[PDB]
């Protein structure tokens, strides 16, 4: 008698660690996997938090009959998941406490930076990306061991409608990092299930929207302000003699009214005050007041990336409005704006409690013959989607291939060596591109260039950029000395690693690819292309391609599980730069291209499969006429 009674028994026996555990869904997780008979270790960083999580449920526990309900929850408080160091801990914690660990709930979530691709520090991308989906794999690789050595175990990674579908990806604007820790969570279930069976099932959940919105409408509202802005500042340079610093200087008064009736402002500027007044709310500042100082920094940022020349100090004077910058009605409006968009993609026209979610998910933890899935606890949303993997195609039309006379190509390599020799011929001796600028990572990358490309090199068609780890210094360098690029071709500097993806029962794993390896994995194969497109997508006219890694008849079964890893989680990336370089004045396209095919399955078909590649390419960065 009671709801709890359908889960008496359900998981007992069973020793669940369940990341992100004191409080939302994985506290409900927690909360449910418990009284279904598992004992469970909480992991979190509030130990307070965790603390009230942890005596909720075992009061609950000893009210449905459970004795010494000390002994089925614990807790592990200050445990912050993207340090290697205390996933360590925990898993020595977990192990000292239980024993084998029989599932793996990684749930941990942080939301990231939440801003733009080209407002977002490459140091917060990373840091999302080790909290969010470095965690996961670091778990997997401590307690897989154990499991597959007892026969049996579970990882399911908790990622979300933002991370896309199987053969789908979902835009997520002002959120690509979490989006792409989201889509590596799912992929990551979809590539590894085959190596892990039949002992260790793995699997993802990806709820849609669950049950303010105010602080996202606030932050929405202040990237407005900021888009709009920047905007405004480079249409009037299209057609104003001033230095950017110069146009910069006509806003430090901070007035509305004073720059819209400036007769020496551009007419997109003064456009712009008119605008924030008649669009205004009369009571916040920022139908006053142009910026304040946070917008302004982020600002001057985007300016300096993409190249302006202004002193750091620029804004140091600036005046700062008066409170509320939004009102609450401002802000408000936006909330049920957010809320009233997201009620309306629900198939159900409701969403789910954090309750519902972990009751569905505590059920499906049961079913014993599925892995490599993704389970959708609540869904039916009505989102557009982009397909990912069509592959018939050919070359684009005439027009478009007659435009690439007399560009600037950049392209970015080095282990592909063929890929960029041919590349680089085809835009210069068959579409006839002024230059191309190669950019490399070692100096015996370099050599290795120049000697394929001697003859474009002594004619002066080809120069070569060494960047080291140093990318977006390398193409300031490029841009300063041979010229805003045309297409840019983004291949990975590194090959992918030839590691086994699991070990053998009885073994100690010691081969199998690492935690340290799989984040160096992240950082080649998905933030060297994040780097570049953060710098690209300021620059106006570039056609970006991000080439995701090769297998070829040679490359092993592992390979080609790491390559598909790559290619889903890159084209949530993709997706979402590509719904935020709408914001911009600059007229960039963003284009992902796969090297490696569905299927794992002589000279000649080789360069049919390199001619392919070449198609691919020129379809995204041949420039369509204006
Ligand atoms: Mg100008
Ligand atoms: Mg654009």
Same mark, same amino acid.
């Given at each position: ?7 008496? $028994? ?8 369940? +990341? $992100? ?45 459970? +004795? ?45 930076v939440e801003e733009m691709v080209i407002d977002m520090p490459?140091?917060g ?16 690789? /401590?307690?897989?061991?154990?499991? /597959? ?16 579908? /199987? ?6 604007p002002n *959120? ?9 969570? *799912? ?28 602080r996202r409408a606030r932050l929405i509202l202040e990237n407005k302000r900021l888009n709009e802005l920047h905007a405004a500042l480079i249409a009037a340079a299209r057609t104003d003699e001033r230095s950017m610093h110069e146009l910069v200087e006509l806003l430090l008064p901070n007035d509305v009214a004073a720059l819209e009736q400036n007769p020496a402002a551009p007419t997109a500027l003064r456009e712009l005050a008119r605008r924030f007044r008649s669009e205004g709310d009369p009571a916040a500042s920022s139908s006053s007041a142009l910026l304040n100082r946070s917008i302004a920094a982020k600002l001057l940022a985007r300016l300096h990336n993409g190249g302006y020349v202004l002193p750091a100090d620029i804004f140091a004077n600036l005046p700062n409005p008066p409170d509320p910058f939004f009102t609450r009605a401002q802000i408000?409006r936006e ?18 409690? !954090? ?28 989102? !557009? ?34 890929? #960029? ?49 140093? %990318?977006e210094?390398?193409?300031d360098?490029?841009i300063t000395?041979?010229?805003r ?10 090959? #992918?690693?030839?590691?086994? #993806?699991?070990? *053998? ?17 992240? !950082? ?10 953060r710098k690209i997508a300021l620059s106006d006219g570039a ?8 297998? +070829? ?13 790559? /290619? ?9 730069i590509?719904?935020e370089s709408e914001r911009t004045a600059q007229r960039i396209? %963003? ?32 420039? #369509?006429?204006?």
């Amino acid at each position: 008698v009671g709801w709890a009674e359908s889960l008496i $028994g359900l998981h007992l026996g069973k020793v669940a660690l369940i +990341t $992100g555990g004191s409080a939302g869904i994985g506290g409900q997780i927690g909360r449910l996997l418990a009284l279904s008979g598992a004992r469970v270790m909480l992991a979190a960083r509030d130990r307070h938090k965790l603390e009230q999580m942890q005596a909720m449920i075992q009061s609950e526990l000893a009210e449905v009959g459970y +004795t010494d309900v000390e002994d089925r929850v614990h807790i592990a408080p200050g445990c912050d998941v993207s340090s290697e160091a205390q996933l360590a801990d925990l898993v020595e914690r977990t192990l000292s406490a239980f024993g084998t660990v029989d599932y793996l709930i990684n749930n941990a979530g942080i939301a990231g930076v939440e801003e733009m691709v080209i407002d977002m520090p490459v140091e917060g991308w990373r840091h999302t990306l080790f909290a969010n989906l470095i965690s996961n794999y670091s778990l997997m690789r /401590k307690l897989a061991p154990l499991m /597959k050595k007892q026969g049996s175990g579970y990882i399911l990674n908790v990622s979300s409608y933002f991370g896309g579908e /199987k053969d789908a990806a979902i835009p997520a604007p002002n *959120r690509a990092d979490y989006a792409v820790s989201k889509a590596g969570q *799912r992929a990551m279930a979809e590539v590894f299930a085959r190596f892990l069976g039949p002992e260790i099932q793995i699997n993802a959940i990806a709820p849609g929207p669950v049950e303010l919105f105010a602080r996202r409408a606030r932050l929405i509202l202040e990237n407005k302000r900021l888009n709009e802005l920047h905007a405004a500042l480079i249409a009037a340079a299209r057609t104003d003699e001033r230095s950017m610093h110069e146009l910069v200087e006509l806003l430090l008064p901070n007035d509305v009214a004073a720059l819209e009736q400036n007769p020496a402002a551009p007419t997109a500027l003064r456009e712009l005050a008119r605008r924030f007044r008649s669009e205004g709310d009369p009571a916040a500042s920022s139908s006053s007041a142009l910026l304040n100082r946070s917008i302004a920094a982020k600002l001057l940022a985007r300016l300096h990336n993409g190249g302006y020349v202004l002193p750091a100090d620029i804004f140091a004077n600036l005046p700062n409005p008066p409170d509320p910058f939004f009102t609450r009605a401002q802000i408000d409006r936006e909330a049920r704006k957010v809320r009233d968009g997201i009620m309306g993609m629900l198939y159900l026209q409701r969403m789910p409690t !954090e309750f519902d979610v972990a009751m569905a998910t505590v059920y499906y933890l049961a079913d014993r013959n599925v892995s490599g899935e993704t389970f959708h606890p609540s869904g039916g949303l009505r989102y !557009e989607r982009t397909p990912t993997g069509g592959e018939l195609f050919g070359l684009p039309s005439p027009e478009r291939l007659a435009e690439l006379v007399g560009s600037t190509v950049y392209l970015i390599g080095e282990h592909l060596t063929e890929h #960029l020799n041919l590349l680089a011929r085809a835009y210069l001796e068959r579409y006839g591109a002024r230059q191309v600028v190669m950019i490399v990572e070692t100096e015996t990358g370099a050599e290795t260039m120049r000697r394929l490309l001697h003859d474009h090199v002594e004619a002066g068609r080809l120069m070569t950029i060494v960047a080291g780890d140093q %990318i977006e210094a390398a193409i300031d360098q490029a841009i300063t000395r041979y010229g805003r690029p045309g297409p840019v071709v983004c291949t990975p500097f590194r090959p #992918l690693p030839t590691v086994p #993806l699991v070990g *053998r029962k009885d073994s100690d794993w010691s081969t199998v690819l690492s935690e340290a390896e799989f984040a160096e994995l992240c !950082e080649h194969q998905l933030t060297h292309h994040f780097r570049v497109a953060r710098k690209i997508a300021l620059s106006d006219g570039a056609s970006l391609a991000l080439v995701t890694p090769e297998t +070829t008849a040679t490359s092993t079964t592992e390979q080609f599980a790491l390559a598909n890893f790559i /290619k889903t989680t890159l084209h949530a990336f993709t997706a979402t730069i590509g719904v935020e370089s709408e914001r911009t004045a600059q007229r960039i396209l %963003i284009n992902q291209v796969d090297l490696t095919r569905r299927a794992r399955a002589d000279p000649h078909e080789r360069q049919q499969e390199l001619e392919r590649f070449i198609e691919a390419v020129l379809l995204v960065t041949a420039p #369509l006429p204006p």
